[PDB]
Amino acid sequence: SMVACETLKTKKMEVQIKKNFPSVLQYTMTDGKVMYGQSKDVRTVEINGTNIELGDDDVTFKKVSDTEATYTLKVKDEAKKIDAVITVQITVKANQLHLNVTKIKNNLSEGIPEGNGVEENAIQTLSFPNQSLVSVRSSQENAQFTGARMSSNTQKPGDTNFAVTEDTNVTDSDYTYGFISGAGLSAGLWSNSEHDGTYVAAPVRGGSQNTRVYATTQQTGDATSLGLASAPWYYHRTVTDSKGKKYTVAETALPQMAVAIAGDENEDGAVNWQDGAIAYRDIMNNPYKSEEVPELVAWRIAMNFGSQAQNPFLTTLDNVKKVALNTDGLGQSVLLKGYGNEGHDSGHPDYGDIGQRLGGADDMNTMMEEGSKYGARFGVHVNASEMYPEAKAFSEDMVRRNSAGGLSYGWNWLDQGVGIDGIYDLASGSRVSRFADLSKEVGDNMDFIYLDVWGNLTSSGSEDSWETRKMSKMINDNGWRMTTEWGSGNEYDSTFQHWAADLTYGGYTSKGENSEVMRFLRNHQKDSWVGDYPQYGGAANAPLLGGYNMKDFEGWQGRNDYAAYIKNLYTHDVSTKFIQHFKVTRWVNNPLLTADNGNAAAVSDPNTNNGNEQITLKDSNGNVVVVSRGSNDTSSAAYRQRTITFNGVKVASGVVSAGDGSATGDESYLLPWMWDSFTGKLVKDSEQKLYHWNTKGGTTTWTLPDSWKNLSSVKVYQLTDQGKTNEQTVAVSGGKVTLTADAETPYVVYKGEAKQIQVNWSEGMHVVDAGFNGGSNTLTDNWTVSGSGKAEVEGDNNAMLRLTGKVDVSQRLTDLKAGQKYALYVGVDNRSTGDASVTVTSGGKVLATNSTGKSIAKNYIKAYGHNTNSNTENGSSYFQNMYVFFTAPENGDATVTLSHKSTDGAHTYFDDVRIVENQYSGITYEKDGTLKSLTNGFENNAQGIWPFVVSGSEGVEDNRIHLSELHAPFTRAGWDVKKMDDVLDGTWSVKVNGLTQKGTLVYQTIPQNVKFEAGAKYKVSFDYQSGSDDIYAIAVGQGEYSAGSVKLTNLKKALGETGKAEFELTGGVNGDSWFGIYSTATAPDLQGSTGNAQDFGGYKDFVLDNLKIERIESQTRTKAEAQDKVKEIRGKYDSKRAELSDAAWQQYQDTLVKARVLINKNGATAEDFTKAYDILVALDEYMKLKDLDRKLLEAARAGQDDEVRILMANGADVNADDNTGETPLHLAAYEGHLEIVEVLLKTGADVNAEDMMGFTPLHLAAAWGHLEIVEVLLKHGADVNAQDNQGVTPLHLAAYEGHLEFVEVLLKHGADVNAQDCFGKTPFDLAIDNGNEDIAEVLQKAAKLGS
C-alpha cells in the first residue's frame, strides 16, 4: 500500500517499478539474472528544453494488472509557461518492457487552432533526462556498450564498441541504436523519437541524422553506471515557412519507447550486443512493407521524358514478361521515372497527373494488375522539393522564397524549376491532398513511392527526421512502401536508397549505410547497404552479405543493354536476395572494426573461420546460412573469396566479378530458391528449384539440399529471354550433381520436368507481340508473313522486325471501339531506297496508309530504346515513328500490315506497333493520295513533337525540347521574371529551352511525317515566340541534314507577343524535302538579366504552335517553258564543273535528269511541266547561293575587302566553309586581313568556329602573328582555352612561336598555363623543346603565381 514499488510479471521476467515515477528498479529473468534500471532518485521531465524535477505530490500511480501500470505526472513551471499533465503507461510482455506516453494535457492551451495555426504555449518537446530504463555497471562482468550512428562513407564505420569501466563518462551521448550488456544480459533501447543528432558521415539531411538513444553515466555507490534513455520526442511542434508564417503541427505519433532483455540468444557462449540485437527485432519499428524486400530480385527504372513516351505502360508490362522468362519468375521492382505529365522532371508536384501519352491511369492499372501475376511491383518517382509553372499545384503559397523575397530557383532544363516551400506544403495539407489524388488513380495497385532529392535542402534548410517521418507516414498511409534517393536518407522508414543500390553514383563518401549494427538488424528489410564496388574500398570491398547492384535497360541515363542487366542480376543480386531470406544471428571478426576507429570491444573469435570474418543467419524454419571470408587481409586474394553454406552444405564459392565492372571473378553457385515470388512463402516440395551460375564457365560438382538427396536425376534448363531452353537430364549420385555451364549463363534446376511460364505478349495493345519479344516463332504464331522477301526477328538486345525484299507482315487488330478514332504508329528505320509502309485495312480495303523512303534523321532520344548510340545497323539508328490515323470500322475487322516494296538487299527495321485512341484529324489528302494539307495545334499528339522529330543539336540527350503546357498566369509572360509565353494557342505548344549558339538543326519534319512531292509547291506557316533576334532560323533541306546544304531564314524576336512566320517550299526531286528549326551562331540578347533570370526570362527560347502546311497552286507552265528553263540552267552552270564539288555536280546532274524525265515522259501534262519548271527555279536559287558562298571564301583568302562587303549584302553565308572546314573568318585570320576579320564579325560570323583540325580563327591568328585579330576575336567572345583535335591551345602555339604579347593577352583573358595537349605537353614544355628559354621562364613565373 505505502510500499514505494510494485512488480509487473510475465513468464520470462519480473520487473520492479517505482510508484513515484515511471522508472524501473530492476528486471529479473526466470533464470535469476538481473538487469538494472534507474537505481537513483531521478524524477526529471523536460518540456520545451526546461528540466522540471517531480515531487511525491506530482505523481499518481495505478497498477492496472500484473502486466500494466499507469502514471499521471503534473509537470509545471510558471516562469517558463509550462503546465502539463502527462499520462505514462508501462507494460510488459515476454522479455519486453514498453513505456508509452498515452496522453498529454496542456492546461495553458485550448489546442491547435484550425488550419494548423500557432498554438500559444504548445508542448513541443518532451523527454525524461537520464531515465536509465536499462543500465550496466563497471562492477558487472563484461560490462559493455555498442552504438550505431549514420555513415554513408565506405571507409568510416558507423559503430562504436567499448567496455564500460570506472572512467566511462558520457552525458546524453546520442545514437541511432544503443545496446548495453553485462552480467549475462543484453538490452537495446528502441524509441520513435524524431530527434536529429550526431552522425559519422552523411551528404544530406532528410532523416539521415535520426538519433533515438541517449547514453548517460552516473555513480551508483562505488561503480560507474551507464544508462540508456530515449532522445526527446516532438509533440506539438511550431514551425515557420519561407515567408515567415508560423504553424503548430500535431504529433506524427505519441511518444513510445521499449527495451527487450536478452540472455545468450545466439548460444555462442558470450553475451554482447548481438544477443540484444536479436531480442531488439521484437520491439523495433519495421519499415512498412519491408517483408517483401527479399522478393525484389530485379530492380530497374523504366523512363519517360520530354513528351516522347519512350516507355508506355503496356510496353513496360511486356518488358516485365521478358525479365520473368529470363529469371524463371523472380520478383521485380520497377521504378516508373516519368510516369506523370510529360515525363521525368515534368509536372512536379502533380502526383495524381498520370502521363496521358503513356496510356494514362487505365494502362498504368493494367500494367500493375497484370505485372503482379509475374511478381512485379511498381512505384513512381515523385518530387516534393521542386515544381514547374505547368503543374496545377504551382501557386504563390507553394513557392519557396529567399530572405529578400525572391524565388528560390531550381534547375532549368525543359522548364525552370522553382523550390517548393516544404513547411507550407506539410502544414497546409497541400502535399497529403496531392498524394490522395494519386491514391484515387492507383487504388491499392501500386507498390511503392520513390521520393527524389529529399534531404538536399531544396524545400527548406531543415528537411529533418520529423518532416521525413511525416512525409513517410502520408506515403505509408496510402499503402505505399517508402523508397528514396540518398544513401543515408530516411533511416526510420525507407526500404531502398537509389544512391545505395546503384553503386556507381557519388563515390565512396556517399553510399549506403556503413554500419555492422544497422545491417545486422535490418539487412533483410532494406536495399540500403554497401554492395561490392572495390574502388571505394572498406565496406565496398566484397561485403559478405553482398548488397544490391542496380542496372537498367529502359532508358534511365541512356541505359539500354538488356544482356548486361540480366548478367548483373545473376552476378550480385540473386545471392544478395537469397541472403535477405535469413536474419543475422552472429557476426564475428569484422575487419572494418578496430581499436583505432573506436571498436576495441568488437568480437574477435579465433575459433571461428580461422579468426576471419563470418556471418551466421537463420530463418524462422530453423534453416542456417553461413557466409565466410577467405582472409581478413585485403592484400590476400582470399579477402574477396566467399563461401556460402545452407544447412552446412556449400551453395556458393569464389570471388564475385567486381561490382565496379573492373575484373571478372570466378564465383559459382547452386542456390536453392525455396520461395514463391509473392509473399515469399515456401513452394510445394515438388516445385522447389536451384539457380546455377558459373562466372568463368566450366564443370562443377555440388551436394544437393537434403530434400533432393534420394533423387536419381534432375532437370536442368538454360534461361534465356524466351524462358527455359535446352533441357538436360543430369544424373544424381550419392546426393551429388555435376553441372557443365557456359560462362555467365543462368541455369535453373528442377526435381522433374518443368513447364514453360505462360506469356501472352502485348496484353491490351490490340496486337499480339507489338515489340517482337516472341522470338522467331512470333512470325509464325502471331504475325503472318507473305511475299518473296524475308522477315526476321533481329537484334540480341531490344529485338526488332527486320524486312528484306518484297515482304508483308500482318496481324489482325483486336479490342477496338467501333467508330472511334485511333492513331497507329510504329518505330521505323529504313536503310533501303524502296518504300517501307504501314497500312491499316478492313476487308481488303485500305483505311489508312503511310510510307517512308530511305530514313534521313538519326534518333537522338537518350531514354528511347533505338537511339543512334544503340546500333540498329552500321553503328547508327534512324528509328522514327511512322503514323496512320483511322476510324475503327463498324464490322470490327481491321488488320495492320508492315511492308517492304523493293526487291533490293537493304534492310528495313520496325518495332513497337502502338494502337492508341487519338483525336488528331489535321491531315487532308489529294485524290492521288498525296498531301493536300497538314495542320497541327499540338493538342492531340499521341507522343513527341510530330510532324517534327528531335535533331542532333545536343547529340543523344534528354533533349530540351518537348510539348509545353498551359497554366496561367505562371506559364505566361509577365509572371515573376518570365518574358515569354510557354503556350501560344490552346493548351499545348512545341517548346525549345536554351538551345542557342549551336550552329545546327534543332528539329525537323521528315518525309514519313509530311511528304513533299517533287516539284510541288507548299505554303508553310506557324505562330512562334523567340527570345532574341536571329538566334533561331527556319531551315529548309533535302535528304539527311548537311551543314551548308540548307536554306536558312533568321526569325526576328517575338518575346511575349506571338509572331507569324510563312514561306514557300518546292519539293526536291528525291521526295526527301523537309523544313525545321535551326539554332544559329548568334548570341541571344539577355537584356541585362543576370543569374536564373537569363534562363527563366525566355531570351534563349523558341515556342512554335499552329503549324499549317498546304499544297498551293503554282503558275502553270507549258512544255516549251519548262524546256527553255532547262536551257537557261544549263547555260548558267554547265561551264562551272571544275569550280564545283564532286557531290555538288552530281546533285546538279541528278536534278536536271529528273526535271527532264517530267518534261519528256509520254503523256506528260501541265502539272508535270509546272513541276519541272519549279524544280529548276529551286535548283537555280540553290546553285546561286553556293556560288556566293564559294566567292565569299575566295575573297576572304585573297583579301578583297569591298568584294566581301557586297557578297554578304547579296546573300553569302558568313558561316560557310571550304574543303578543310575553314570559315571566311578562319581564312581572314590565317592570311592576316584585320578589316575583313572586323567586317565578318559585324555580319555575324561564328567566333569559335572549328575547321577539320579543330582550329578556331584564334588558333590560326596566334600561330601566324596577327595581334589585333587576336584582341578583336577575344572582345567578341573567342574561347581563349579552345583546344584543337590534338588538345593544342592558342597558348601552346604562342609559346612554340615566341612572342610575349600573345602569351600576356591570352593569360590576361584567362589562358590556362596548365593546359596539356594529347602528348601531355604544356605551353612551357613546347617552349623549352625549340630553344625559346625566354618565354619558358615567363611561363614558369606565370605557373608559379598560382602554385
Binding site: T1220, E1222, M1253, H1292, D1317, L1326, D1329
Partner: peptide
Amino acid sequence: PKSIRIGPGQAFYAX
C-alpha cells in the same frame, strides 16, 4: 614527335 606550323588541313603534330 615533330611539330609543324598549323594551317588549313595541317595539324600541329605529325609524330
